[PDB]
Ligand binder design. Structure first.
Ligand SMILES: C[C@H]1CCC[C@@H](O)CCC/C=C/c2cc(O)cc(O)c2C(=O)O1
Ligand SMILES: C[C@H]1CCC[C@@H](O)CCC/C=C/c2cc(O)cc(O)c2C(=O)O1
Lengths: 264, 264
């Protein structure tokens, strides 16, 4: 049985969140698009091994759109880690395993470095460290231009699984549609320079497990692989590209549970 | 003015080879397909910056097909390094900068480790260290079935640039056609276990520059990036996939000259 509800935190944000299961806490942090329905079937699968799985739309996105502007403009890993700690405080989640891709990847690493007593272990996927002009440039476009371009980039290029991406269904793509412009304006200029992965030696020894997409072109996250290896941090592959929890939910969920079990 | 000629080495191989320019020696070793026409426009570009550029079809391939069977069956980095040393002996090339992709990548690092006095510096691209069963399994297919499959894999998937691949023209594709089966039967089962990168500390400090394709899916040469980083070896990207000297000849040739200049 899945809890679907809202909860507020004193930084002005009213989070849509979901939660299933009983056990050690595992938290699934969304990617830049902030849409936690992406995790839907994995939440059930992780929870069915023995875990409490919690997830939530991110601030200004989808059903957590009721939030102040500092919360989705000039976004940084450190700001997002703060937000996620706040919703963990509110849900009384004291010690959490965390997953995150993209801006969520930067969030979970910032979580791990910033709040080490809170984080049992952190799985980051495809941590954006480099400014990409094709993304940054969309921000100056009109909202509806942005949705069209980005919806298409996800559908045809980088879902890692187009049928799975389509099958999320119309409600989700209608929420995504509204999120594309707030993401485009809030994330790509300021998320990469905030990458909390320039201090190699802070990563060393930490309980951190890094993945990249198997089918993702090598240039996108080449740098993650270099950085992990310099720092001794476990690094490997999941199938797909940026959304393995959409395209390969079974392999995704198995990986989250195995990795969490490694750290109980 | 380009020398196009043959020369014979005492291991039974008659090499087709080409050579242009005057300067320090730079040697372009083909990938598994053994076809040196792939380097055509680069040979002129590299040479025009004050190098003597040499290249050749590989044994049992294209115009270097007159060779004994040991030279293109159960092929290995160490065997290939031997073969190229032999043709460098014959052409009286005493010190050489070397490039190689794929089996050529393995060859040039075996060269570097095995004949250090001979190798000024080695650029290796996409060094195959893993057995792939989809490749190994083509070997039992009918020659002509292997050509069709493999011609099509290069054209549609892994060229890194279809137009450029097509533009090489009919003569080269007709030589490739014959090479695909010799390659499939000779290389994929035995080239990877011969990977001369299991001794990390032999690589350390050597004058080696490693690249992978930018557009190449991350899983194919993930392991190169890990291995280079562990060994302090310089590692970066070129555009395209397995054949940057076909798809991006300009950036290929610039990279070979810049990198060679770093080592005079
Ligand atoms: C929203 C996803 C879209 C993936 C598109 C994907 O194809 C582009 C992948 C590289 C960029 C991801 C990205 C980069 C940033 O600077 C900030 C981010 O929040 C992301 C990120 O979350 O990417
Ligand atoms: C000729 C190309 C095949 C291109 C398909 C290419 O996409 C196949 C995947 C990469 C591996 C290539 C490879 C592997 C080996 O064990 C030995 C080899 O000589 C190669 C190699 O030369 O690769």
């Amino acid at each position: 049985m899945r809890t679907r509800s809202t909860i507020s935190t004193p930084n002005g944000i009213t989070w849509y969140y979901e939660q299933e299961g009983t056990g050690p806490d595992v938290v699934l942090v969304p990617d830049g698009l902030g849409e936690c329905q992406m995790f839907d079937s994995s939440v059930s699968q992780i929870a069915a091994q023995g875990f409490r799985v919690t997830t939530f739309d991110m601030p200004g996105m989808s059903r957590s759109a009721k939030a102040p502007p500092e919360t989705y403009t000039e976004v940084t890993a450190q700001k997002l880690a703060s937000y996620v700690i706040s919703v963990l405080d509110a849900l009384d989640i004291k010690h959490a395993t965390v997953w995150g891709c993209a801006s969520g990847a930067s969030t979970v690493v910032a979580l791990l470095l910033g709040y080490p007593d809170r984080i049992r272990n952190a799985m980051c996927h495809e941590l954006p460290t480099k400014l990409l002009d094709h993304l940054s440039n969309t921000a100056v476009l009109e909202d509806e231009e942005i949705s069209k371009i980005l919806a298409n980039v996800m559908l045809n290029d980088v879902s890692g699984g187009s049928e799975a991406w389509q099958a999320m269904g119309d409600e989700v793509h209608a929420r995504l549609h509204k999120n594309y412009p707030v993401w485009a304006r809030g994330y790509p200029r300021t998320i990469p320079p905030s990458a909390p992965v320039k201090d190699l030696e802070a990563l060393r020894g930490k309980p951190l497990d890094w993945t990249v997409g198997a089918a993702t072109p090598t240039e996108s996250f080449f740098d993650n692989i270099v950085t992990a290896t310099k720092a001794g941090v476990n690094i490997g592959l999941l199938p797909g590209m940026h959304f393995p929890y959409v395209s390969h939910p079974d392999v995704f969920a198995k990986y989250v549970v195995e990795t969490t079990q490694k750290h109980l």
